[PDB]
Coordinates of N, CA and C in Angstrom, one line a residue:
Chain A
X2 N 8.5 9.4 18.0 CA 7.6 10.4 17.7 C 6.8 10.0 16.4
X3 N 5.9 9.1 16.5 CA 5.1 8.7 15.4 C 3.6 8.8 15.7
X4 N 3.2 8.9 17.0 CA 1.8 9.3 17.2 C 1.5 10.6 16.8
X5 N 2.3 11.6 17.2 CA 2.1 13.0 16.8 C 2.0 13.2 15.4
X6 N 3.0 12.6 14.5 CA 2.9 12.8 13.2 C 1.7 12.3 12.6
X7 N 1.2 11.1 13.1 CA 0.0 10.4 12.6 C -1.2 11.3 12.9
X8 N -1.3 11.8 14.1 CA -2.3 12.7 14.5 C -2.3 14.0 13.6
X9 N -1.1 14.5 13.3 CA -1.0 15.7 12.5 C -1.4 15.5 11.1
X10 N -1.0 14.4 10.5 CA -1.4 14.0 9.1 C -2.9 13.6 9.1
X11 N -3.5 13.1 10.1 CA -4.8 12.9 10.2 C -5.7 14.2 10.1
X12 N -5.2 15.2 10.9 CA -5.9 16.5 10.9 C -5.7 17.2 9.5
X13 N -4.6 17.1 9.0 CA -4.4 17.6 7.6 C -5.4 17.0 6.6
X14 N -5.4 15.7 6.6 CA -6.3 15.1 5.7 C -7.8 15.5 6.0
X15 N -8.2 15.5 7.2 CA -9.6 16.0 7.5 C -9.8 17.4 7.1
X16 N -9.0 18.2 7.3 CA -9.0 19.7 6.8 C -9.0 19.8 5.4
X17 N -8.4 18.9 4.6 CA -8.4 18.9 3.3 C -9.7 18.4 2.7
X18 N -10.3 17.4 3.5 CA -11.7 16.9 3.1 C -12.7 17.9 3.3
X19 N -12.6 18.7 4.4 CA -13.6 19.8 4.6 C -13.3 20.9 3.6
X20 N -12.2 21.0 3.2 CA -11.6 22.0 2.1 C -12.4 21.7 0.8
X21 N -12.3 20.5 0.4 CA -12.8 20.0 -0.9 C -14.3 20.0 -0.9
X22 N -15.0 19.6 0.3 CA -16.4 19.7 0.5 C -16.9 21.2 0.4
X23 N -16.2 22.1 1.0 CA -16.7 23.5 1.1 C -16.4 24.1 -0.3
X24 N -15.3 23.7 -1.1 CA -15.1 24.4 -2.3 C -15.9 23.9 -3.4
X25 N -16.5 22.6 -3.2 CA -17.7 22.1 -4.2 C -17.3 20.8 -4.7
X26 N -16.0 20.2 -4.5 CA -15.5 19.0 -5.1 C -16.3 17.9 -4.3
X27 N -16.6 16.8 -5.0 CA -17.5 15.8 -4.5 C -16.6 14.8 -3.6
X28 N -17.0 14.9 -2.3 CA -16.4 13.9 -1.4 C -17.5 13.4 -0.4
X29 N -17.4 12.1 0.0 CA -18.3 11.5 0.7 C -18.3 11.9 2.2
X30 N -19.4 11.4 2.8 CA -19.4 11.7 4.3 C -18.5 10.8 5.1
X31 N -18.0 9.5 4.5 CA -17.2 8.5 5.1 C -15.9 9.2 5.3
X32 N -15.3 9.9 4.3 CA -14.1 10.6 4.3 C -14.2 11.8 5.0
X33 N -15.3 12.4 5.1 CA -15.5 13.8 5.7 C -15.4 13.8 7.2
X34 N -16.0 12.9 7.8 CA -15.8 12.6 9.3 C -15.4 11.2 9.5
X35 N -14.1 10.8 9.2 CA -13.6 9.6 9.8 C -12.7 9.9 11.1
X36 N -12.5 8.8 12.0 CA -11.8 9.1 13.2 C -10.4 8.9 12.8
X37 N -9.7 8.9 14.1 CA -8.2 8.7 13.8 C -7.9 7.3 13.5
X38 N -8.9 6.4 13.8 CA -8.5 4.9 13.8 C -8.8 4.5 12.3
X39 N -9.6 5.0 11.6 CA -9.7 4.8 10.1 C -8.6 5.1 9.4
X40 N -7.9 6.3 9.8 CA -6.7 6.8 9.1 C -5.6 5.8 9.5
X41 N -5.4 5.5 10.9 CA -4.4 4.7 11.3 C -4.4 3.3 10.7
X42 N -5.6 2.7 10.6 CA -5.7 1.4 10.1 C -5.5 1.4 8.5
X43 N -5.9 2.4 7.8 CA -5.9 2.5 6.4 C -4.7 3.1 5.8
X44 N -3.8 3.7 6.6 CA -2.5 4.1 6.2 C -1.3 3.5 6.8
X45 N -1.5 3.1 8.0 CA -0.4 2.2 8.6 C 0.4 2.7 9.8
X46 N 0.1 3.8 10.4 CA 0.5 4.2 11.9 C 2.1 4.4 12.1
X47 N 2.9 4.2 10.9 CA 4.3 4.4 11.0 C 4.7 5.4 10.0
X48 N 4.6 6.8 10.4 CA 5.1 7.8 9.3 C 6.5 7.8 9.1
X49 N 7.3 7.3 10.0 CA 8.7 7.3 9.9 C 9.1 6.0 9.3
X50 N 9.6 6.1 8.1 CA 10.2 5.0 7.3 C 9.1 3.8 7.2
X51 N 7.9 4.2 7.0 CA 6.9 3.0 7.1 C 5.8 3.3 6.0
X52 N 4.5 2.7 6.3 CA 3.6 2.6 5.4 C 2.9 3.9 5.1
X53 N 2.4 4.7 6.1 CA 1.9 6.0 5.8 C 2.9 7.1 5.5
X54 N 3.7 6.8 4.6 CA 4.6 7.8 3.9 C 3.8 8.6 2.8
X55 N 4.3 9.7 2.6 CA 3.6 10.6 1.7 C 3.5 10.0 0.1
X56 N 2.8 10.7 -0.7 CA 2.8 10.4 -2.1 C 2.4 9.1 -2.6
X57 N 1.1 8.7 -2.7 CA 0.2 7.6 -2.5 C -0.4 7.7 -1.1
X58 N -0.6 8.7 -0.5 CA -1.7 9.1 0.2 C -2.5 10.3 -0.3
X59 N -2.0 10.9 -1.5 CA -2.5 12.2 -1.9 C -3.9 12.0 -2.6
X60 N -4.8 12.9 -2.2 CA -6.2 13.0 -2.6 C -6.4 13.5 -4.1
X61 N -7.1 12.9 -4.9 CA -7.7 13.5 -6.0 C -9.2 13.4 -6.0
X62 N -10.0 14.6 -6.3 CA -11.4 14.6 -6.3 C -11.9 15.2 -7.4
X63 N -13.3 15.3 -7.7 CA -13.9 15.8 -8.8 C -15.1 16.8 -8.4
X64 N -15.3 17.7 -9.3 CA -16.4 18.7 -9.0 C -17.8 18.1 -9.0
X65 N -18.7 18.6 -8.2 CA -20.0 18.0 -8.2 C -20.9 18.1 -9.4
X66 N -20.9 19.1 -10.1 CA -21.7 19.2 -11.3 C -21.2 18.6 -12.4
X67 N -20.0 18.4 -12.7 CA -19.4 17.5 -13.8 C -18.0 16.9 -13.2
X68 N -17.9 15.7 -13.5 CA -16.6 14.9 -13.2 C -15.6 15.1 -14.2
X69 N -15.4 16.4 -14.7 CA -14.4 16.6 -15.8 C -13.2 17.5 -15.1
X70 N -13.5 18.6 -14.5 CA -12.5 19.3 -13.7 C -12.2 18.6 -12.5
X71 N -10.9 18.4 -12.2 CA -10.4 17.6 -11.1 C -9.4 18.3 -10.2
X72 N -9.4 17.9 -9.0 CA -8.5 18.6 -8.1 C -7.6 17.6 -7.3
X73 N -6.4 17.6 -7.7 CA -5.5 16.8 -6.8 C -5.1 17.6 -5.6
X74 N -4.5 17.0 -4.6 CA -3.6 17.6 -3.6 C -2.3 16.8 -3.7
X75 N -1.3 17.3 -3.2 CA 0.0 16.6 -3.0 C 0.8 16.9 -1.9
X76 N 1.2 15.9 -1.1 CA 1.8 16.3 0.1 C 3.4 15.8 -0.1
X77 N 4.3 16.8 -0.4 CA 5.6 16.3 -0.7 C 6.3 15.8 0.4
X78 N 7.5 15.1 0.2 CA 8.2 14.5 1.3 C 9.1 15.5 1.8
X79 N 9.6 16.4 0.9 CA 10.7 17.4 1.3 C 10.1 18.4 2.2
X80 N 10.9 18.9 3.2 CA 10.5 20.0 4.0 C 10.4 21.3 3.1
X81 N 11.5 21.6 2.4 CA 11.5 22.8 1.5 C 11.5 22.3 0.1
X82 N 10.3 22.3 -0.6 CA 10.2 21.9 -1.8 C 10.8 22.8 -2.8
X83 N 11.1 22.3 -4.1 CA 11.7 23.2 -5.0 C 11.3 23.0 -6.4
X84 N 11.9 23.6 -7.4 CA 11.4 23.7 -8.8 C 11.5 22.2 -9.4
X85 N 12.6 21.5 -9.1 CA 12.8 20.1 -9.6 C 11.8 19.2 -9.0
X86 N 11.3 19.6 -7.8 CA 10.4 18.8 -7.0 C 8.9 19.3 -7.2
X87 N 8.7 20.3 -8.2 CA 7.4 20.6 -8.7 C 7.1 20.3 -10.0
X88 N 8.2 20.3 -10.8 CA 7.9 20.0 -12.3 C 7.7 18.5 -12.5
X89 N 8.0 17.7 -11.5 CA 7.5 16.3 -11.6 C 6.1 16.4 -11.4
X90 N 5.5 17.1 -10.5 CA 4.0 17.3 -10.3 C 3.4 17.9 -11.5
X91 N 4.0 19.0 -12.1 CA 3.3 19.7 -13.2 C 3.4 18.6 -14.5
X92 N 4.4 17.7 -14.4 CA 4.4 16.6 -15.4 C 3.3 15.6 -15.1
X93 N 2.9 15.4 -13.9 CA 1.7 14.6 -13.7 C 0.4 15.4 -14.2
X94 N 0.3 16.6 -14.0 CA -0.7 17.5 -14.4 C -0.8 17.3 -16.0
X95 N 0.2 17.6 -16.7 CA 0.2 17.6 -18.2 C -0.1 16.2 -18.7
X96 N 0.3 15.1 -17.9 CA 0.1 13.7 -18.2 C -1.4 13.5 -18.1
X97 N -2.2 14.1 -17.2 CA -3.6 13.9 -17.2 C -4.3 15.1 -18.0
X98 N -5.6 15.0 -18.1 CA -6.3 16.1 -18.6 C -6.7 17.1 -17.6
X99 N -6.1 17.0 -16.3 CA -6.7 17.8 -15.2 C -6.0 19.2 -15.3
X100 N -6.5 20.2 -14.5 CA -6.1 21.6 -14.6 C -5.3 22.0 -13.4
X101 N -5.7 21.6 -12.1 CA -5.2 22.4 -11.0 C -5.1 21.4 -9.7
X102 N -4.4 21.9 -8.7 CA -4.2 21.1 -7.5 C -3.7 21.9 -6.4
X103 N -3.5 21.3 -5.3 CA -2.8 21.8 -4.1 C -1.5 21.2 -3.8
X104 N -0.7 22.0 -3.2 CA 0.7 21.5 -2.5 C 0.7 21.9 -1.1
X105 N 0.7 21.0 -0.2 CA 0.6 21.2 1.2 C 2.1 21.0 1.6
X106 N 2.9 22.1 1.7 CA 4.3 21.8 1.9 C 4.5 21.7 3.5
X107 N 5.6 21.2 3.9 CA 6.1 21.0 5.2 C 6.8 22.1 5.9
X108 N 7.7 22.6 5.3 CA 8.4 23.9 5.6 C 8.1 24.8 4.5
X109 N 8.6 26.1 4.6 CA 8.4 27.0 3.6 C 8.9 26.8 2.3
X110 N 8.2 27.2 1.2 CA 8.5 26.8 -0.1 C 9.6 27.7 -0.5
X111 N 10.3 27.4 -1.6 CA 11.4 28.2 -2.1 C 10.8 29.3 -3.0
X112 N 11.4 30.5 -3.1 CA 10.8 31.4 -3.8 C 10.7 31.3 -5.4
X113 N 11.8 30.6 -5.8 CA 11.8 30.4 -7.3 C 10.7 29.5 -7.7
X114 N 10.4 28.5 -7.0 CA 9.2 27.6 -7.4 C 7.9 28.4 -7.2
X115 N 7.8 29.3 -6.2 CA 6.7 30.3 -6.1 C 6.5 31.1 -7.2
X116 N 7.5 31.6 -7.8 CA 7.4 32.4 -9.0 C 7.1 31.4 -10.2
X117 N 7.6 30.1 -10.1 CA 7.1 29.1 -11.1 C 5.5 28.8 -11.1
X118 N 5.0 28.9 -9.9 CA 3.6 28.7 -9.6 C 2.9 29.9 -10.2
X119 N 3.5 31.1 -10.1 CA 3.0 32.3 -10.8 C 3.0 32.1 -12.3
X120 N 4.1 31.4 -12.8 CA 4.3 31.6 -14.3 C 3.3 30.8 -15.2
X121 N 3.1 29.5 -14.8 CA 2.2 28.7 -15.5 C 0.7 28.8 -15.0
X122 N 0.6 29.7 -14.1 CA -0.8 29.9 -13.5 C -2.1 30.0 -14.5
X123 N -1.9 30.7 -15.6 CA -3.2 30.7 -16.5 C -3.4 29.4 -17.2
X124 N -2.3 28.6 -17.4 CA -2.5 27.3 -17.9 C -3.1 26.5 -16.8
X125 N -2.3 26.4 -15.7 CA -2.8 25.5 -14.6 C -2.9 26.3 -13.2
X126 N -4.2 26.5 -12.9 CA -4.5 27.4 -11.7 C -4.3 26.7 -10.4
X127 N -3.0 26.5 -10.0 CA -2.7 25.7 -8.8 C -2.0 26.6 -7.8
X128 N -2.1 26.0 -6.5 CA -1.7 26.9 -5.4 C -1.1 26.1 -4.3
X129 N -0.7 26.6 -3.3 CA -0.1 26.0 -2.1 C -0.7 26.3 -0.8
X130 N -0.4 25.5 0.1 CA -0.8 25.7 1.6 C 0.4 25.2 2.5
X131 N 0.4 25.5 3.7 CA 1.4 25.1 4.6 C 0.9 24.1 5.6
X132 N 1.8 23.4 6.2 CA 1.4 22.2 7.2 C 0.8 22.9 8.5
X133 N 1.5 23.9 9.0 CA 1.1 24.6 10.3 C -0.2 25.3 9.9
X134 N -0.4 25.7 8.7 CA -1.6 26.5 8.3 C -2.8 25.6 8.3
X135 N -2.7 24.3 8.1 CA -3.7 23.3 7.8 C -4.1 22.5 8.8
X136 N -3.7 22.6 10.0 CA -4.0 21.9 11.1 C -5.3 22.4 11.9
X137 N -6.0 23.3 11.2 CA -7.3 23.9 11.6 C -8.1 24.3 10.4
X138 N -9.3 24.0 10.5 CA -10.4 24.7 9.6 C -10.8 25.9 10.2
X139 N -10.1 27.0 9.8 CA -10.4 28.4 10.3 C -11.8 28.8 9.9
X140 N -12.4 28.3 9.0 CA -13.9 28.5 8.8 C -14.8 28.2 10.0
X141 N -14.3 27.1 10.8 CA -15.0 26.7 12.0 C -14.9 27.8 13.1
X142 N -14.0 28.7 13.1 CA -13.7 29.5 14.1 C -15.0 30.5 14.2
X143 N -15.2 31.1 15.5 CA -16.4 31.9 15.8 C -16.2 33.3 15.1
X144 N -15.1 33.8 15.0 CA -14.9 35.1 14.4 C -15.2 35.1 12.9
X145 N -15.0 34.0 12.3 CA -15.1 33.9 10.9 C -16.6 33.7 10.4
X146 N -17.1 34.7 9.7 CA -18.5 34.4 9.3 C -18.7 33.5 8.0
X147 N -19.9 33.4 7.6 CA -20.1 32.4 6.4 C -19.8 33.1 5.1
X148 N -18.7 32.5 4.4 CA -18.4 32.9 3.1 C -18.9 32.2 2.0
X149 N -19.4 32.7 1.0 CA -20.1 31.9 -0.2 C -19.6 32.6 -1.5
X150 N -19.2 31.7 -2.4 CA -18.6 32.3 -3.6 C -19.7 32.4 -4.7
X151 N -19.8 33.6 -5.2 CA -20.9 34.1 -6.1 C -20.6 33.6 -7.5
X152 N -21.7 33.3 -8.1 CA -21.6 33.0 -9.5 C -21.8 34.1 -10.4
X153 N -21.3 34.3 -11.6 CA -21.1 35.5 -12.4 C -22.6 36.0 -12.8
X154 N -23.6 35.2 -13.0 CA -24.8 35.5 -13.3 C -25.5 36.2 -12.0
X155 N -25.0 35.8 -10.9 CA -25.6 36.4 -9.7 C -24.8 37.8 -9.4
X156 N -23.6 37.8 -9.9 CA -22.7 39.1 -9.7 C -23.4 40.1 -10.7
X157 N -23.8 39.8 -11.7 CA -24.6 40.7 -12.7 C -25.8 41.2 -12.1
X158 N -26.5 40.4 -11.5 CA -27.8 40.8 -10.8 C -27.6 41.6 -9.7
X159 N -26.4 41.4 -8.9 CA -26.1 42.2 -7.8 C -25.7 43.6 -8.3
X160 N -24.8 43.8 -9.3 CA -24.5 45.0 -9.8 C -25.6 45.8 -10.4
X161 N -26.6 45.1 -11.0 CA -27.7 45.6 -11.6 C -28.7 46.2 -10.6
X162 N -28.9 45.5 -9.5 CA -29.8 45.8 -8.4 C -29.4 47.1 -7.7
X163 N -28.2 47.3 -7.3 CA -27.7 48.3 -6.5 C -27.2 49.4 -7.4
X164 N -27.2 49.2 -8.7 CA -26.7 50.2 -9.8 C -25.3 50.7 -9.4
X165 N -24.4 49.9 -9.3 CA -23.0 50.4 -9.0 C -22.0 49.4 -9.7
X166 N -20.8 50.1 -9.7 CA -19.8 49.4 -10.6 C -18.8 48.3 -9.6
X167 N -18.0 47.7 -10.4 CA -17.3 46.5 -9.9 C -16.2 46.9 -8.8
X168 N -15.7 48.3 -8.9 CA -14.8 48.7 -8.1 C -15.3 49.4 -6.9
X169 N -16.6 49.8 -6.8 CA -17.2 50.5 -5.8 C -17.5 49.6 -4.6
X170 N -17.3 48.2 -4.6 CA -17.7 47.4 -3.6 C -16.5 47.5 -2.5
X171 N -16.9 47.0 -1.3 CA -15.8 46.7 -0.4 C -15.1 45.5 -0.9
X172 N -13.8 45.4 -0.5 CA -13.0 44.4 -1.3 C -12.1 43.6 -0.2
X173 N -11.5 42.6 -0.8 CA -10.7 41.6 0.0 C -9.5 41.2 -1.0
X174 N -8.3 41.1 -0.3 CA -7.1 40.7 -1.0 C -7.1 39.3 -1.2
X175 N -6.4 38.8 -2.3 CA -6.4 37.4 -2.8 C -5.6 36.5 -1.7
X176 N -4.7 37.3 -0.9 CA -3.7 36.5 -0.1 C -4.3 36.1 1.3
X177 N -5.4 36.7 1.8 CA -5.9 36.3 3.0 C -6.4 34.9 3.2
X178 N -6.4 34.3 4.5 CA -6.7 32.8 4.6 C -8.0 32.4 4.1
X179 N -8.9 33.2 4.0 CA -10.4 32.7 3.7 C -10.4 32.7 2.2
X180 N -10.1 33.7 1.5 CA -10.1 33.7 0.0 C -9.1 32.7 -0.5
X181 N -8.0 32.5 0.1 CA -7.0 31.5 -0.2 C -7.6 30.2 0.1
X182 N -8.4 30.1 1.2 CA -9.0 28.8 1.5 C -10.0 28.3 0.5
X183 N -10.9 29.1 0.0 CA -11.7 28.7 -1.1 C -11.0 28.7 -2.3
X184 N -10.1 29.7 -2.6 CA -9.3 29.6 -3.7 C -10.0 30.2 -4.9
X185 N -9.8 31.5 -5.0 CA -10.5 32.4 -6.0 C -9.7 33.4 -6.5
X186 N -9.8 33.7 -7.7 CA -9.1 34.7 -8.5 C -9.6 36.1 -8.3
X187 N -9.1 37.1 -8.7 CA -9.6 38.5 -8.6 C -10.8 38.6 -9.6
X188 N -11.5 39.9 -9.4 CA -12.6 40.0 -10.2 C -13.8 39.0 -9.9
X189 N -14.1 38.6 -8.6 CA -14.9 37.4 -8.2 C -15.4 37.8 -6.9
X190 N -16.7 38.0 -6.7 CA -17.2 38.6 -5.4 C -17.7 37.5 -4.5
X191 N -17.7 37.8 -3.2 CA -17.9 36.8 -2.1 C -19.0 37.4 -1.2
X192 N -20.2 36.5 -1.1 CA -21.0 36.9 -0.1 C -20.5 36.6 1.3
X193 N -20.8 37.5 2.2 CA -20.5 37.2 3.6 C -21.8 37.3 4.4
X194 N -22.3 36.3 5.1 CA -23.4 36.3 5.9 C -22.9 36.2 7.3
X195 N -23.4 37.2 8.2 CA -23.0 37.2 9.5 C -24.2 37.6 10.4
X196 N -24.1 37.3 11.7 CA -25.2 37.7 12.6 C -25.0 39.2 13.0
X197 N -26.1 40.0 13.0 CA -26.1 41.2 13.6 C -26.8 41.4 14.8
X198 N -26.2 42.1 15.7 CA -26.8 42.4 17.0 C -27.8 43.5 17.0
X199 N -28.0 44.3 16.0 CA -28.9 45.2 15.8 C -30.2 44.8 15.0
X200 N -30.0 44.2 13.9 CA -31.2 43.6 13.1 C -30.7 42.2 12.5
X201 N -30.8 41.3 13.2 CA -30.7 39.9 12.8 C -29.5 39.5 12.0
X202 N -29.7 39.4 10.8 CA -28.7 38.8 9.8 C -28.3 39.9 8.9
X203 N -27.0 40.0 8.4 CA -26.6 40.9 7.5 C -25.6 40.2 6.4
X204 N -25.9 40.5 5.2 CA -25.1 40.1 4.2 C -24.3 41.2 3.5
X205 N -23.1 41.0 3.2 CA -22.2 41.9 2.6 C -21.5 41.2 1.5
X206 N -20.7 42.0 0.6 CA -20.1 41.5 -0.5 C -18.6 42.1 -0.7
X207 N -17.6 41.1 -0.5 CA -16.3 41.6 -0.7 C -15.8 41.0 -2.1
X208 N -15.1 42.0 -2.8 CA -14.6 41.7 -4.1 C -13.1 41.4 -4.0
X209 N -12.7 40.3 -4.8 CA -11.3 39.8 -4.6 C -10.4 40.8 -5.5
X210 N -9.5 41.3 -4.8 CA -8.5 42.2 -5.5 C -7.0 41.8 -5.1
Chain B
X852 N -53.9 11.8 10.4 CA -52.6 12.5 10.6 C -51.5 11.5 10.9
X853 N -51.8 10.4 11.6 CA -50.9 9.4 11.9 C -50.4 8.7 10.7
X854 N -51.3 8.3 9.7 CA -51.0 7.7 8.5 C -50.1 8.6 7.5
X855 N -50.5 9.9 7.6 CA -49.7 10.8 6.7 C -48.3 10.9 7.2
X856 N -48.1 11.1 8.5 CA -46.8 11.2 9.1 C -45.9 10.1 8.9
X857 N -46.4 8.9 9.0 CA -45.6 7.7 8.8 C -45.3 7.5 7.4
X858 N -46.2 7.9 6.4 CA -45.8 7.8 5.0 C -44.8 8.8 4.7
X859 N -44.8 10.0 5.2 CA -43.9 11.0 4.9 C -42.5 10.7 5.5
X860 N -42.4 10.1 6.7 CA -41.1 9.7 7.2 C -40.5 8.5 6.5
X861 N -41.3 7.5 6.1 CA -40.8 6.4 5.3 C -40.3 7.0 3.9
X862 N -41.0 7.9 3.3 CA -40.5 8.4 2.0 C -39.2 9.2 2.2
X863 N -39.1 10.0 3.1 CA -37.8 10.7 3.4 C -36.6 9.8 3.7
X864 N -36.9 8.7 4.5 CA -35.8 7.8 4.8 C -35.4 7.1 3.4
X865 N -36.3 6.6 2.6 CA -35.9 5.9 1.3 C -35.1 6.9 0.5
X866 N -35.7 8.2 0.3 CA -35.0 9.1 -0.5 C -33.5 9.3 -0.1
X867 N -33.3 9.7 1.2 CA -32.0 9.9 1.7 C -30.9 8.7 1.5
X868 N -31.5 7.5 1.9 CA -30.7 6.3 1.8 C -30.3 6.1 0.3
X869 N -31.2 6.3 -0.6 CA -30.9 6.1 -2.0 C -29.9 7.2 -2.5
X870 N -30.0 8.3 -2.1 CA -29.1 9.4 -2.6 C -27.7 9.1 -1.9
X871 N -27.7 8.7 -0.8 CA -26.3 8.5 -0.3 C -25.6 7.3 -0.9
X872 N -26.5 6.3 -1.2 CA -25.9 5.0 -2.0 C -25.4 5.4 -3.3
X873 N -26.2 6.2 -4.1 CA -25.7 6.6 -5.3 C -24.4 7.5 -5.3
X874 N -24.4 8.5 -4.4 CA -23.1 9.2 -4.2 C -22.0 8.3 -3.8
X875 N -22.1 7.2 -3.0 CA -21.1 6.3 -2.7 C -20.6 5.5 -3.9
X876 N -21.7 5.2 -4.8 CA -21.1 4.4 -5.9 C -20.4 5.3 -7.0
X877 N -20.9 6.6 -7.2 CA -20.1 7.5 -8.0 C -18.7 7.8 -7.4
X878 N -18.6 8.0 -6.1 CA -17.3 8.1 -5.5 C -16.4 6.8 -5.6
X879 N -17.0 5.6 -5.6 CA -16.3 4.4 -5.7 C -15.8 4.2 -7.2
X880 N -16.5 4.6 -8.1 CA -15.9 4.4 -9.6 C -14.8 5.6 -9.8
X881 N -15.1 6.8 -9.2 CA -14.0 7.7 -9.4 C -12.8 7.4 -8.5
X882 N -12.9 6.4 -7.4 CA -11.9 6.1 -6.6 C -11.2 5.0 -7.3
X883 N -11.7 4.2 -8.2 CA -11.1 3.3 -9.0 C -10.2 4.0 -10.2
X884 N -10.8 5.1 -10.8 CA -10.0 5.9 -11.7 C -8.8 6.6 -11.1
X885 N -9.1 7.2 -10.0 CA -8.0 8.0 -9.3 C -6.9 7.0 -8.7
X886 N -7.4 5.7 -8.5 CA -6.3 4.8 -8.0 C -5.4 4.5 -9.2
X887 N -5.9 4.3 -10.4 CA -5.1 4.0 -11.5 C -4.3 5.2 -11.8
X888 N -4.7 6.5 -11.8 CA -3.8 7.5 -12.2 C -3.0 8.1 -11.0
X889 N -3.4 7.7 -9.7 CA -2.7 8.1 -8.5 C -1.6 7.4 -8.1
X890 N -1.7 5.9 -8.4 CA -0.6 5.1 -7.9 C 0.7 5.3 -8.7
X891 N 0.6 5.9 -10.0 CA 1.8 6.1 -10.7 C 2.4 7.5 -10.3
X892 N 1.7 8.5 -9.6 CA 2.1 9.7 -9.1 C 2.2 9.5 -7.5

């Protein structure tokens, strides 16, 4: 059972590349759509006790406007990762000058380390994802419309145009897969562009709460 | 019109090829830096 795990890690890496391209971090077209064979040749086809093991396949990227804020990901070897197996990663964070990263766990994370991710959050705004969660770019689905993250200067223009307050908008909770996909804090509004069957196109605005 | 269209297409080809090469070189420099700080983690 190594073809399936290789295919699975290939789709994970591909979805992470589309994740980092949609989020804004600079990634090239070569990594954006590679086939299975570039992955197999460049990591080594043997996920069980072989060359494409975890941790030294993990991606680090940089944002497009400046190469100062940087985004790791980390794919842990453990099925259920823990505090002692994330403080290593947080040590790599504080070792660098970087701020934040992803953790794509294999099985469900332990609750204590989830509370840990909560506690050093204002220092390091890092988050997790799941393996089963990341075998599909759910943005590509037909039900999901186009989400765009608004800049604060545009949010001010929005609230000034319609003359309304920040709590009167329709809203979205921080835990749903799209806002967790882009990765956004509360107090941050999101354009949704969707096709209308009555009049063409329609834009709306969900505020993260 | 033929001359104008050929000039425009050659200009767009050169511009896109140049931009892709520059982005590849930026990514390559950052690939060296992330290799240095990634191999240890």
